[PDB]
Design an enzyme around this catalytic site. Structure first.
Site, short mmCIF file in Angstrom:
data_model
loop_
_atom_site.label_atom_id
_atom_site.label_comp_id
_atom_site.label_asym_id
_atom_site.label_seq_id
_atom_site.Cartn_x
_atom_site.Cartn_y
_atom_site.Cartn_z
N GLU A 81 0.09 5.82 -4.08
CA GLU A 81 0.05 4.40 -3.91
C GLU A 81 -0.43 3.55 -5.05
OE1 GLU A 81 -0.50 3.70 0.93
OE2 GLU A 81 -2.26 3.43 -0.35
N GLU A 85 3.92 8.00 4.07
CA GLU A 85 2.65 7.78 4.71
C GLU A 85 2.72 6.54 5.59
OE1 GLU A 85 -1.62 6.38 3.42
OE2 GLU A 85 -1.05 8.20 2.35
#
Lengths: 291, 293
Positions: B135, B222
């Site tokens: 991320e 995710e």
């Protein structure tokens, strides 16, 4: 981005330079206490646009007998904390994550759960400052606060090794002098100094001077312009003396409180906002803007 | 064996056919973070028998100042990854090897070391999917993520030429629309899409729609059923809206997280496992069990 905070001697450095910051402390985050409406991105943004605040303190309530605290509404309080931390990051402001307790050493598992959670979620940001024990009562620095602090500091650091951690001192965080006689042996630790101008005068400032003389860094995470119970008139003489003492020692601070409860410490008049400041709010606005 | 994953247009094909896979994502593998205990062959086997999972994501922690990460305990984290990867191959499941970072572009030497090691040890298996940057935060797709990605994809590809590589996008992997405007010219590259049902809704699906319409394939490596921070109550309707968006577009996904931390996102209760699921665990099990595996 904000500059990384570290401790060197009795000074907290930002990016390696001597400086200090000022901002407001939000009131207790507790469900049912009326300040939930201020734990918003809008409010964090306004602290910056209205007062030029460079930090904001999120007072996350804790207490086994304290209504609406983390012991009763974990989710509500943690969601309010998340909103404020993310907004502070977006606004390039420091955020003091305050476990707002008077009994952290006796509810340690909860304190560890809180700190491991905040270190995991927000530790990567230099904006994050951990305040592990708001206001210990009349307890032992060496036997009660220090062991709890060492335990929590180590739990936070196994997750987030880089950060400034501010530790509460005895007698509602007034005994920085006592803490200074036996400092915590960990990197980047500062100690909490709390005072209310209408009640704590020169002798209380003398205790802080003793601490600085002994080599520890102080962070005034909570202070008021009124009396210690959060009400009464604004004591300008004492407020100015404390602010001069902080300016000449690079001590950062957060004023109690960005709230509208019917008491003198509130920045806003009841049901009011930034355009309707109380006598305390008016003085605080000038202090923060001129910091 | 599992089918080979390739990309054609905005679709990820398995054996040349349109389809998708679902499974759980393990929590950070970091030493001291309490989830190391889940990186076992038994856990991989149970994800398949208990949830019908067809994939498992190994979140190998990375961070120069992230405690217990690959930067502090290389062998411990790598050993946990090894255990999960081998078990996935033994169970005919895909394994997403995730360099779980928020700063991969700023610690490239570690990313390269990690990827060359994993490509050398496991690249021969079609079960392996590489996720090179979990991320990215508030950074630039064109100036920061893309150059990093090209570098890492090339290091992996010089060892293991066949595989699907998933690349993180800006703002916690939400800005797939931005990445779609300047895609990477490498074969079989998909882009990361992350969301939490209690926080992200139709506007985020619209950003993903923009990306798909622009020609890039997405992989939701995710996602959570609760709020973005990992806690809160399950938002059933929003979770269902996202699962429908994924099913209709054949977007594979991994739920956060196979762990027992006391937070809404954990599949298990504290000190619990498969037989003691949280409200999120129950909802995730329902989704994975009926996905098609």
């Amino acid at each position: 981005a904000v500059e990384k905070l570290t401790v060197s001697g009795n000074q907290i450095l930002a990016g390696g330079e001597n400086t200090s910051f000022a901002g407001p402390s939000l009131f207790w985050s507790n469900t049912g206490w009326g300040a939930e409406k201020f734990y918003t991105a809008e409010t964090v943004a306004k602290a910056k646009t209205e007062f030029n605040a460079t930090l904001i303190r999120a007072a996350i309530g804790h207490g086994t007998s304290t209504g609406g605290s983390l012991n009763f509404d974990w989710e509500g309080n943690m969601s309010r904390l998340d909103t404020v931390v993310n907004a502070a990051i977006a606004e390039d402001m420091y955020v003091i994550i305050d476990f707002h307790s008077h009994e952290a050493h006796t509810d340690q598992a909860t304190a560890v759960r809180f700190f491991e959670d905040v270190a995991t979620k927000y530790g990567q940001y230099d904006n994050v400052i951990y305040e592990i024990y708001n206001e210990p009562l009349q307890i032992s620095w060496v036997n009660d606060i220090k062991p709890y602090a060492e335990t929590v500091i180590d739990k936070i650091r196994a997750i987030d090794p880089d950060n400034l951690i501010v530790v509460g001192t005895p007698t509602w965080s007034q005994d920085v002098d006592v803490a200074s006689q036996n400092p915590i042996d960990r990197a980047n630790i500062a100690y909490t100094l709390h005072f209310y101008a209408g009640t704590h005068g020169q002798s209380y400032r003398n205790k802080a001077q003793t601490a600085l003389d002994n080599g520890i860094a102080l962070f005034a995470t909570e202070w008021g312009t009124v009396n210690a119970d959060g009400n009464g008139g604004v004591n300008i003489n004492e407020t100015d003396a404390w602010m001069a003492f902080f300016k000449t020692n690079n001590i950062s601070h957060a004023n109690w409180a960005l709230n509208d409860k019917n008491e003198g410490a509130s920045l806003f008049t009841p049901g009011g906002s930034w355009n309707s400041l109380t006598s305390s709010g008016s003085k605080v606005k000038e202090i923060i803007q001129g910091w």
